[PDB]
Design an enzyme around this catalytic site. Structure first.
Site, PDB file in Angstrom:
ATOM      1  N   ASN A   1       0.860  -1.157   0.000  1.00 47.92           N
ATOM      2  CA  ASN A   1       0.000   0.000   0.000  1.00 47.92           C
ATOM      3  C   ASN A   1       0.909   1.223   0.000  1.00 47.92           C
ATOM      4  O   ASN A   1       1.546   1.510   1.026  1.00 47.92           O
ATOM      5  CB  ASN A   1      -0.897  -0.038   1.233  1.00 47.92           C
ATOM      6  CG  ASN A   1      -1.671   1.242   1.429  1.00 47.92           C
ATOM      7  OD1 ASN A   1      -1.896   1.990   0.494  1.00 47.92           O
ATOM      8  ND2 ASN A   1      -2.058   1.514   2.664  1.00 47.92           N
TER       9      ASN A   1
ATOM     10  N   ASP B   1      -8.105  -3.620   5.832  1.00 51.37           N
ATOM     11  CA  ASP B   1      -7.158  -2.949   6.727  1.00 51.37           C
ATOM     12  C   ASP B   1      -7.636  -1.576   7.221  1.00 51.37           C
ATOM     13  O   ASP B   1      -6.879  -0.626   7.231  1.00 51.37           O
ATOM     14  CB  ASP B   1      -5.776  -2.840   6.065  1.00 51.37           C
ATOM     15  CG  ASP B   1      -5.353  -4.125   5.409  1.00 51.37           C
ATOM     16  OD1 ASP B   1      -5.176  -5.113   6.143  1.00 51.37           O
ATOM     17  OD2 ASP B   1      -5.232  -4.142   4.167  1.00 51.37           O
TER      18      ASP B   1
END
Ligand code: CL
Length: 289
Positions: free
Chosen positions: A32, A142
């Site tokens: 990410n 997440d």
């Protein structure tokens, strides 16, 4: 309207994916990685750059991105477009200029984040979850304090990026297992109720002022050790009743059995009576210009 961008446009916007433009929290080599940039029209953007081989089939990438792109809501940092040129896979969203919950909550400078602002965050993010679920995007990957962003007016928004996995097949380790719901550990799969568990961890963050592992928080909660759980920096900002009400909501979210967790509408309803300082603008409450 959701649109496609060329890789040249996005390299120009981000100064060639310059490292100082990274606004995410895991550096340059992570699953990410998000860069700030600015388009030729002066629009500021956030660009999530996926790893090579994460979404190798551009048709599948585009289908997902376009699906996320249909969502438009005031509690979201919305997806504006994507790029899939030259093996790159990018998501382009609205830029959020007031940084993250993590910054203001965990890495405060002037003073701890105010209770009233923490509760406003909780409510607005629950609203974001209600919206996403309403549009058939109930999975969120997440969710934590780094995925809660603050807009131009210091209002909290949920990052659209977590609506898509970091890779179609790669096992992500983007959330430490201490924070993942128990059903993920068993199955490796995310369900709609999984994000509710994650929301419970966000409530624990807000309550405690740190990213407290659920196992440890739940022990404190079992003991009704509210003084050890709650952020000492909140002292005098909240009634025991309201602190306790929020802890009770966290406990519901963190239930082992997914069916026992609240649905998003129930989170929103539960948050309403806890709101404080409604008349105060977010920039004043958050302490930003
Ligand atoms: Cl793919």
């Amino acid at each position: 309207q959701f649109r496609e961008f060329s890789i040249e446009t996005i390299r120009n916007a981000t100064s060639g994916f310059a490292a100082e433009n990274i606004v995410s929290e895991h550096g340059e080599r992570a699953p990410n990685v998000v860069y700030k940039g600015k388009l030729e029209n002066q629009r500021r953007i956030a660009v999530k750059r996926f790893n090579r081989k994460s979404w190798p089939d551009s048709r599948q990438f585009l289908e997902e991105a376009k699906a996320v792109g249909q969502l438009r809501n005031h509690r979201m940092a919305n997806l504006l477009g994507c790029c899939y040129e030259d093996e790159e896979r990018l998501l382009i969203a609205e830029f959020m200029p007031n940084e993250t919950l993590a910054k203001h909550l965990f890495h405060w400078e002037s003073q701890p984040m105010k209770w009233a602002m923490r509760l406003r965050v909780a409510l607005h993010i629950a609203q974001a979850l209600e919206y996403c679920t309403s549009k058939g995007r109930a999975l969120y990957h997440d969710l934590n304090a780094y995925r809660v962003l603050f807009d131009d007016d210091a209002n909290p928004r949920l990052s659209c990026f977590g609506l898509m996995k970091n890779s179609r097949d790669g096992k992500s380790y983007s959330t430490n297992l201490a924070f993942t719901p128990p059903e993920y550990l068993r199955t490796g799969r995310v369900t709609p109720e999984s994000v509710i568990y994650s929301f419970g961890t966000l409530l624990l963050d807000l309550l405690s002022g740190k990213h407290i592992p659920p196992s440890h928080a739940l022990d404190l909660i079992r003991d009704r050790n509210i003084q050890m759980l709650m952020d000492s920096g909140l002292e005098g900002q909240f009634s025991s009743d309201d602190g306790t009400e929020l802890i009770r909501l966290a406990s519901r979210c963190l239930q082992y059995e997914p069916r026992e967790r609240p649905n998003p509408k129930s989170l929103v309803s539960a948050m309403i009576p806890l709101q404080k300082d409604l008349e105060i603008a977010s920039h004043q409450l958050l302490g930003v210009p």
